[PDB]
Nucleic acid binder design. Structure first.
Ligand SMILES: [Mg+2]
Ligand SMILES: [Mg+2]
Ligand SMILES: [Mg+2]
Ligand SMILES: [Mg+2]
Ligand SMILES: [Mg+2]
Ligand SMILES: [Mg+2]
Ligand SMILES: [Mg+2]
Ligand SMILES: [Mg+2]
Ligand SMILES: [Mg+2]
Ligand SMILES: [Mg+2]
Ligand SMILES: [Mg+2]
Ligand SMILES: [Mg+2]
Lengths: 209, 176, 38, 140
RNA sequence: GUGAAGAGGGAAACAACCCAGACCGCCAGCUAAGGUCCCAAAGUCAUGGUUAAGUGGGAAACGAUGUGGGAAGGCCCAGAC
RNA sequence: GAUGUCGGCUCAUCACAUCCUGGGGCUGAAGUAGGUCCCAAGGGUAUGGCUGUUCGCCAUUUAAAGUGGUACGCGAGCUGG
RNA sequence: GCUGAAAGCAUCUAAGCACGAAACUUGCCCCGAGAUGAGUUCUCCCUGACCCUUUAAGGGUCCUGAAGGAACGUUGAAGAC
C-alpha cells in the first residue's frame, strides 16, 4: 500500500529549533505495478509492485520475462498490497513516490535488522551478568541454564541460549514523516529504520494507528 | 389444576399466521413473529388460539405456559401499543430526544445518545421525563433498563434515572 | 456475606431462595439491605 | 498345507459420499471409521492398506451430544511450553468446522502407520455439495 | 489364600487382587473372570423404568420448591391456594 | 560397587489459596479512602544497614514490594560465608 | 438484567433474549507449505535416431544437451564453517 526502496544514512533538520528531527531519507523511486493479483486466479486480492528499476542487465530469464505491457522496464524486488484499487500496470503506469499520506501521518518503515552474527546470552537478551569475586571459569558471561532437576529438562525451548542475532525484519512501526520531495524522491522519517547502507526497506502506510 | 392458559382472542387487526412453528401477527401496531419451541403446535379456529405440546413430557407441558402467554402479549401489544416510562431525578440530569438518539445529560463529562432499536420510539414531555413506547414488549423491556442503567439510583439520594414506579425512596441512614 | 456453602435464609420476605441454589439470609424488599449471592 | 485369508494388496477404491449433512454425529463416526478399515469386507483384513475412500459432506453441522456443544473442549497443547496449552470449545469451532468429525473419527484407528495413512480417505468439507472435485468424477 | 518357587486370561499399565495351575504339536470346537460402537474379539440386543448432572468417570458435615415412587394429614365448589 | 548440605549468584518454569493493576456483590459504603467476599494468572511484583543466613528488624522507596511447587528448582553452571 | 412458565402471582432459566474484565479468540510484530493434508499464481527451457528383452515394465547405445544450478575468482554493513 506504498512503495518500497532502499534508504541511505540519516540526518538532522534544524529549523524552529527541533534538530531532534533525525531524518532517515530513504529514496523511493518509481513503483510500477508489474502484476495485479485478484480474487479469481492469483489467489487473494494483493497488487504487486516493484518500486525500483536498478539497471539489471544480467538477470535470469523468467524474471526478464516477468515484465509485459508498454515500456517493459526491469527492477528486482517485488512487493504488493491487498485491498485497494491500484491499476493494471506492468512496469509501466508508474505508481508514485508521493503516496497519499497528506503531510502529518505516521509511516511504518520495515527493513532487515543488521546482523551481529553468533551472539552470547549477554548481547542477545539483557538478562545475563555474573560477578568477578571468584570462579573465573564461569566469568561474567555463561548463564546458569534451565532450572528444574528431575523434570528431565524439556528445557522449555526458549530461555535465551546464545545464537546468532539474525537480520530478521523489524518494522519500527509509527514514525511521523517530515518531508517527501515529490520529484527528488527521498521522503524523510524520524530516526529508527533498521538495516544499514541501502537495505531494501518497505516503508508501509500507518497501520500502527 | 389452578393454572394453565386457554384464551387468546383474534379481534380485528389480529392477522395471526402459523408456518409449522413460526407465528407472524399483524395489526394497528406492527409486524411481530416468534417461532416457538419445536413440539409447539399452535393454530387458530376463528378466535381462540391454542399452543400445541407434542406430548405430556415434563419440559414439554410447561413449555405451553410460557408460550400461550408470549403470543398473547404479541396480540395485546399489536392492538394497544405498548408504553412504559421512566423519570430522571438529580440536579443537572436532563432529557431530550431527536427521533432516535435520545440524548442523555445525566452527570458524566459529556452527554450521550442511546439509539433505540426499531419498533419503539420515545418522547421527553419535559427535560425530566422520558416515555418509551412501542409494539414488541421484548425490545421494550431491555431498552427500559438499558436506559435507566445509564445511571442506577443510589440509596443516599435516589438520583439517577428510575422507572416511573420504583418504590425505592432513598437510603438507610448513612454512617461511616 | 454472599456465603459459600449455606447459611439457611431466615427472615420472611427473603427471596423464594429458588434459582441455582441461592440461600443467603437477608430479606429482600429491603431497598438497601441485600445479603445474597455475589 | 492349509490356507490363509486372502487380502494380498486388494483394490476396492470407492467414492461413497457419506453426506451426514445433519444430526448424525458421534456414533456416526464409527461407521466412517469402520468403513475405513473394511467392515463388510469384500475381501479386506484389518491389516492391509486402503481406507475405502469416503466423503463426509457438510460436517460443519452436528447436533453433537446433549450439551457438549457449549461444554466440551479438545485440548491440544502446542509444544513450546510456556505452558500455553491451547483449549477451544465446540461452539467455538467457527473458523474450521471441517476439523472436527475428522478429529473424532481419528483415534478410532489402529494407531500407527496403517491407520495413519488411512484417515485421508475422509475428505473434510464443510459446505455440502462443494468442491466435490476431491472425486468429482465418480461417487455413490 | 496367592507371590516367593506360576506361566495363560482379567483390573488401561500393576509379584500379592478376580478367573485359572502352561507334558509337546493343531489356521478345530465350549466355556471362566471380564466383556460385545470404533481403537479391539463378540448385542449400536429385546421387555420395562431412572438420569439430564457427561452423573457414570474422586471427596464430608451440612444445604436445597431438582426430579421418581409410597403412605398419612391441614384448609377447601357453604368456594381454598 | 557415592542421589554432594544451607545461604548467595545466574537463569528460571508452573500453581492460585491474587500482593499491584482489571471487573463485580454486601458494608456499621456521603465523598476520599477503606473492610470483606466473588471473578481474574495478561503483565508487573525495591535499593540498602546488621547477620552465613533463609527469615527477620531497621532506613528509604514503590502501583505493589504476593504464598507456594519445581531433589526446601538451579555445584558434569559459578561461589564456599 | 429483560421476557416468561413450571408455580394464574412472582421469578435472570426451564424456551428466548441483553449487557459484562489486563483472563479466552482476534487485532499488532516475527516465523511459517516437510501444511508428506508437501497448497496457489506469474514467467523460462527441452518436440534427434535405433536396439534386446522375459514387452506396456522396461533395460540399453549414439546424437544431444536448454532454462537453471553449481564451481572458480573479486568480494560484502553477510558470516564459526
Ligand atoms: Mg579452580
Ligand atoms: Mg519424560
Ligand atoms: Mg493397539
Ligand atoms: Mg528367595
Ligand atoms: Mg461360544
Ligand atoms: Mg468389533
Ligand atoms: Mg465425573
Ligand atoms: Mg481464584
Ligand atoms: Mg533484605
Ligand atoms: Mg534445593
Ligand atoms: Mg565445577
Ligand atoms: Mg567455609
Amino acid at each position: 500500500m506504498i512503495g518500497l526502496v532502499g534508504k541511505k544514512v540519516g540526518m538532522t533538520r534544524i529549523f524552529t529549533e527541533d534538530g531532534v528531527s533525525i531524518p532517515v531519507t530513504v529514496i523511493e523511486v518509481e513503483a510500477n505495478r508489474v502484476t495485479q493479483v485478484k480474487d479469481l486466479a492469483n489467489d487473494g486480492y494483493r497488487a504487486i509492485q516493484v518500486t525500483t528499476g536498478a539497471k539489471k542487465a544480467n538477470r535470469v530469464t523468467k524474471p526478464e520475462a516477468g515484465h509485459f505491457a508498454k515500456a517493459g522496464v526491469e527492477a528486482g524486488r517485488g512487493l504488493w498490497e491487498f485491498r485497494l484499487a491500484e491499476g493494471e500496470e506492468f512496469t509501466v503506469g508508474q505508481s508514485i513516490s508521493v503516496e497519499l499520506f497528506a503531510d502529518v501521518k505516521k509511516v511504518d518503515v520495515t527493513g532487515t535488522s543488521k546482523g551481529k552474527g553468533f551472539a552470547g546470552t549477554v548481547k542477545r537478551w539483557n538478562f545475563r551478568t555474573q560477578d568477578a569475586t571468584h570462579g573465573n571459569s564461569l566469568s561474567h558471561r555463561v548463564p546458569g541454564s534451565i532450572g528444574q532437576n528431575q523434570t528431565p529438562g524439556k528445557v522449555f525451548k526458549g530461555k535465551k541460549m546464545a545464537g546468532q542475532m539474525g537480520n530478521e525484519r523489524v518494522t519500527v512501526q509509527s514514525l511521523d514523516v517530515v518531508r517527501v520531495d515529490a520529484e527528488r524522491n527521498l521522503l524523510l522519517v524520524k530516526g529508527a529504520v533498521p538495516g544499514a547502507t541501502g537495505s531494501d526497506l518497505i516503508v508501509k502506510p500507518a497501520v500502527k494507528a | 389444576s389452578r393454572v394453565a392458559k386457554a384464551p387468546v382472542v383474534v379481534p380485528a387487526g389480529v392477522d395471526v399466521k402459523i408456518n409449522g412453528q413460526v407465528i407472524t401477527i399483524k395489526g394497528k401496531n406492527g409486524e411481530l413473529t416468534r417461532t416457538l419451541n419445536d413440539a409447539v403446535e399452535v393454530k387458530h379456529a376463528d378466535n381462540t388460539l391454542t399452543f400445541g405440546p407434542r406430548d405430556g413430557y415434563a419440559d414439554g407441558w410447561a413449555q405451553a405456559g410460557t408460550a400461550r402467554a408470549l403470543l398473547n402479549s404479541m396480540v395485546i401489544g399489536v392492538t394497544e401499543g405498548f408504553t412504559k416510562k421512566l423519570q430522571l431525578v438529580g440536579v443537572g440530569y436532563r432529557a431530550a430526544v431527536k427521533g432516535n438518539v435520545i440524548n442523555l445529560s445525566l452527570g458524566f463529562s459529556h452527554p450521550v445518545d442511546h439509539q433505540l432499536p426499531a419498533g419503539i420510539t420515545a418522547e421527553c414531555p419535559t427535560q425530566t421525563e422520558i416515555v418509551l413506547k412501542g409494539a414488541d414488549k421484548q425490545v421494550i423491556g431491555q431498552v427500559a433498563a438499558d436506559l435507566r442503567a445509564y445511571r442506577r439510583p443510589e440509596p443516599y439520594k435516589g438520583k439517577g434515572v428510575r422507572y416511573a414506579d420504583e418504590v425505592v425512596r432513598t437510603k438507610e441512614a448513612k454512617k461511616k | 456475606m454472599k456465603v459459600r456453602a449455606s447459611v439457611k435464609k431466615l427472615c420472611r420476605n427473603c427471596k423464594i431462595v429458588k434459582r441455582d441454589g441461592v440461600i443467603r439470609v437477608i430479606c429482600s424488599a429491603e431497598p438497601k439491605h441485600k445479603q445474597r449471592q455475589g | 498345507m492349509k490356507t490363509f485369508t486372502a487380502k494380498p494388496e486388494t483394490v476396492k477404491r470407492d467414492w461413497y459420499v457419506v453426506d451426514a449433512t445433519g444430526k448424525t454425529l458421534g456414533r456416526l463416526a464409527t461407521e466412517l471409521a469402520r468403513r475405513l478399515r473394511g467392515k463388510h469386507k469384500a475381501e479386506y483384513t484389518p491389516h492391509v492398506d486402503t481406507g475405502d475412500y469416503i466423503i463426509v459432506l457438510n460436517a460443519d453441522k452436528v447436533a453433537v451430544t446433549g450439551n457438549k456443544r457449549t461444554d466440551k473442549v479438545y485440548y491440544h497443547h502446542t509444544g513450546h511450553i510456556g505452558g500455553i496449552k491451547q483449549a477451544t470449545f465446540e461452539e467455538m469451532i467457527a473458523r474450521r468446522p471441517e476439523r472436527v468429525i475428522e478429529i473424532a473419527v481419528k483415534g478410532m484407528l489402529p494407531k500407527g502407520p496403517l491407520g495413519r495413512a488411512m484417515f485421508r480417505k475422509l475428505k473434510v468439507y464443510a459446505g455440502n455439495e462443494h468442491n466435490h472435485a476431491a472425486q468429482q468424477p465418480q461417487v455413490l
